[PDB]
Design a protein around this ligand. Sequence first.
Ligand code: HEM
Ligand SMILES: NC1=N[C@@]2(c3ccc(F)cc3F)CO[C@@H](c3cn[nH]c3)C[C@H]2CS1
Ligand code: NA
Ligand SMILES: [Zn+2]
Ligand SMILES: [Zn+2]
Ligand SMILES: [Zn+2]
Ligand SMILES: [Zn+2]
Length: 457
Amino acid sequence: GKLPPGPLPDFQNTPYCFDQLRRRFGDVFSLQLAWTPVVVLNGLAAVREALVTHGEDTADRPPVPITQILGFGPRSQGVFLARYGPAWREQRRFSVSTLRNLGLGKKSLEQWVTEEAACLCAAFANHSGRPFRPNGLLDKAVSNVIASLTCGRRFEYDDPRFLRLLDLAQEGLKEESGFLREVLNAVPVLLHIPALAGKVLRFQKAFLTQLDELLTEHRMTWDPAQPPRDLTEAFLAEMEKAKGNPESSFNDENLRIVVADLFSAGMVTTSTTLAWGLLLMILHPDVQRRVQQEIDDVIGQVRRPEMGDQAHMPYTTAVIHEVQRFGDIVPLGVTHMTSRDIEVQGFRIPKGTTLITNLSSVLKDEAVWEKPFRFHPEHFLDAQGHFVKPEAFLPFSAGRRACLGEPLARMELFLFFTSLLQHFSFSVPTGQPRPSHHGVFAFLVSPSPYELCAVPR
Ligand code: HEM
Ligand SMILES: NC1=N[C@@]2(c3ccc(F)cc3F)CO[C@@H](c3cn[nH]c3)C[C@H]2CS1
Ligand code: NA
Ligand SMILES: [Zn+2]
Ligand SMILES: [Zn+2]
Ligand SMILES: [Zn+2]
Ligand SMILES: [Zn+2]
């Protein structure tokens, strides 16, 4: 019956405040936000006990009132914010299966991704020896991969509409944070104000509008007489079969939500991680050279990298995992909710409680990692040089809600990272201050703005 302790009654720096509250109270501490009860879980033990051991009771999502503006409904919640039930499970299984059918885990997508990497490399080279922010180009290349899986196409890096879609998605990501989002979600009746409802998610609404245009175009080119060439076509085919069935999650409202979630996720996660990767490679040239050494020993500077090479490249694999661990791009994960009363680390957590998984505290747990606050590839290496992955490596969280994009992320991260280090050498621009290894929080944590030089090899 003993509830977790907590302070009795900034969101632009939330992961920072939680760690201060962490060491103060403990691993499992409670805290009050408006009329919403919240329990924050810290360290591998607490997170694992909640998401795995009590996985059936913590796989649910809290209600998010402001999503009513985006056309949400019982069979229209997509996957991400979908309540733990049939609608979530139908869409989740669909995404996992459809991605797998489209060549995820095969040589097919593998060669497509490394084709986009070639386009990315060419864009890098066009900047000569000049210093530049590589973020925009990383977004485009990574976005084309997920666009290829969902929309069945890629976009040119100068495409006006592609650029706007990426820009809106990035601005929409900022709207996923802030303090205003919290108040409207804490007390929903403030949303009744018509003048207020049009500002809260101004860019996310713009993104959806821009996406609708592309979907409409895609509908026209869809050939239902042929097997689905991408995820959207597969969804449409299921939507046709589901005509007359009110229980199906395959509807128009859900099509745009699923595609939006997948595309934007496909973009801002992998590219931010890659942005962390390049930053850490110019801050640690020694590590960069050792990776390039392994590439030349396994792949060479000639042919494009393949997923078969990763098993023979433990150091590069270690570096990539360390980029994810140090990068820590989803510090507080995604909020869960208890659908039943549970027991975590002795304390009692009642049904309906919002759970916050502090994944940061797992990736940088001092009890597990040797040098949690340092960039240290040997976190994933033994003395022999073998790749080892600790249990505390949970950047994709855990349990029934664990990131479904992890297989895509894994192959994208390896294929893009290796291809970029295979042909380029990155460094801090001479005359410029040492780029901070601290990041900026906005739900996702991106590295602070930096520039680099990309000289070909
Ligand atoms: C470095 C890359 C990525 C990281 C670190 C990451 C991390 C995460 C995390 C922490 C969650 C929350 C899991 C939870 O609720 O406990 C999540 C969920 C999710 N991610 Fe990712 N992700 C990445 C890439 C992707 C990609 C590429 C896609 C899609 C193409 C994707 C789609 C999703 C979806 C749909 C969910 C919700 C799953 C569900 O609610 O059942 N993610 N991810
Ligand atoms: N709630 C959402 N937030 C994300 C997101 C939300 C709103 C936007 F405008 C753009 C985004 F990218 C950020 O986190 C992504 C993510 C994927 N795995 N982990 C995070 C998933 C996307 C779409 S749904
Ligand atoms: Na995992
Ligand atoms: Zn198509
Ligand atoms: Zn460092
Ligand atoms: Zn070994
Ligand atoms: Zn080259």
